[PDB]
Design a binder for this molecule. Sequence first.
Ligand SMILES: CCCCCCCCCCCCCCCCCC(=O)OC[C@H](COP(=O)([O-])OCC[N+](C)(C)C)OC(=O)CCCCCCCCCCCCCCCCC
Lengths: 57, 459
Amino acid sequence: GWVRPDLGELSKVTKVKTDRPLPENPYHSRARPEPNPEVEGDLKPARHGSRLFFWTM
Amino acid sequence: MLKYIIPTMMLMPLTWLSKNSMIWINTTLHSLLISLTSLLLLNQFGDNSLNFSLTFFSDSLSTPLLILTMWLLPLMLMASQHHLSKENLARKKLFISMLILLQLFLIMTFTATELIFFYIMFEATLVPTLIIITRWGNQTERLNAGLYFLFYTLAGSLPLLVALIYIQNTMGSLNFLILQYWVQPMPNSWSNTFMWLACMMAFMVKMPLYGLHLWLPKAHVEAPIAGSMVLAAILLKLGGYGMMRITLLLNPITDFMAYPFIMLSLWGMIMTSSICLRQTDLKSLIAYSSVSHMALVIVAILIQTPWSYMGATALMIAHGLTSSMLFCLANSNYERVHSRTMILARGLQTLLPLMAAWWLLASLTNLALPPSINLIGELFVVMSTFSWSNITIILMGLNMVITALYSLYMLITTQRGKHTHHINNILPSFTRENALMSLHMLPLLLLSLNPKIILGPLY
Ligand SMILES: CCCCCCCCCCCCCCCCCC(=O)OC[C@H](COP(=O)([O-])OCC[N+](C)(C)C)OC(=O)CCCCCCCCCCCCCCCCC
């Protein structure tokens, strides 16, 4: 009493219930480096203009 | 200094919109009005220099030079109109426009507080002078003279730009007011030696220094009359003003680095006076006289004592007026005889007596006749150099003897003796030439009455 699978049935994707814990780190990745700080704050006007040689603005 | 720049940039549309026959009249008129309004710069205080804004200022050193520039422009305007009467109107307006542009750059040079602004204007004066010399000259060697002048100046002065940018990057600012209060001693090393060289050789090539003076007697004898005036009377003083401004940051290295330049200038003033004793041309004679007097100013600035500074600034103002007048007289004679040789025409006192009187006055003030400001400056430098070392009185006195010798040799060969026979186009002097001579003389003699206004910032 075994019925053969139809066309397209053995390629179906199923769900498996098992008792093993999920591996937290399968890739054995090290600690990630600290990211750069993000630019924040309101944009004030430039202090004393261009500050390039003699230019006052 | 916006009340003196804006009338200059308004003088430009005045000569570019005038009529065919009224360009000279209107431009002379309004440049004389600007020269009158220049007197407001004399608001000097005993402790604080006159400061205008963040970019412009005027101490007691740049005030006589500014008054000299904006007084000199009308004089070139009067004297540069007899050899341009047969000229196209557009070319005449172009000549006048370059003169106004050069005056604008000069008044934006002395006044600028920030040092790199002074450098930008100091190199901006190169273009109109070269254009005037190489376009409105008369001889073949004017192109070579322009090449020599431009390349001596720029080859001496691009290291100055590099050193100035380094000074900006080290001290933090190139403002002159801050540099009076943020100056540091510069120690003994090769790097400071080459910094001193880069800071000084630009101004002493422009000044000029002996050995580096080869650009001057070429650029003077092939320039027009106005170009010769503005070369002799103002454009040589950019080096002196720059030296006075830039020796502030070059302590305490100058007391044993400035020896070879002092020796060069002393033997150079002796040798150039000796050259003037054997010169076949009037213009080259005046050029080498200028080289000698500028060597004197170099020594005065280099030894850096207060009496030397007073004598130096009086010497630059007096030499500017005297050399400009001598060039004017030589150009009047060149217009009359159409040749540059001093020995060609002789005995002009019998034909042109009043011009002979002006020749006498110019030659007397050139050999430092007291109480004129020429001997005021020469005298102060002489006392300062005697304080420096005693054998300088030997050198200075030899220079004075040869100076009197060549001035009176020039006067005798041009004005006295039997008149020439085959030259018969000596017209009487115009009112224009006599008026120009009187405009050169009368401030120069009047400044002996009140000489306290040209005695530098430490009067
Ligand atoms: C008129 C003709 C002759 C012109 C002579 C002009 C002066 C001669 C020397 C000029 C050198 C170039 C400008 C140097 C400015 C130095 C400013 C500075 O920061 O100095 C300290 C710096 C200090 O070095 P640093 O800045 O690298 O080090 C940092 C400071 N420490 C030492 C504390 C770590 O000096 C230098 O960098 C070296 C300066 C000498 C460079 C030598 C190469 C040029 C040689 C001269 C060429 C002249 C023109 C030749 C062509 C003429 C036309 C054909």
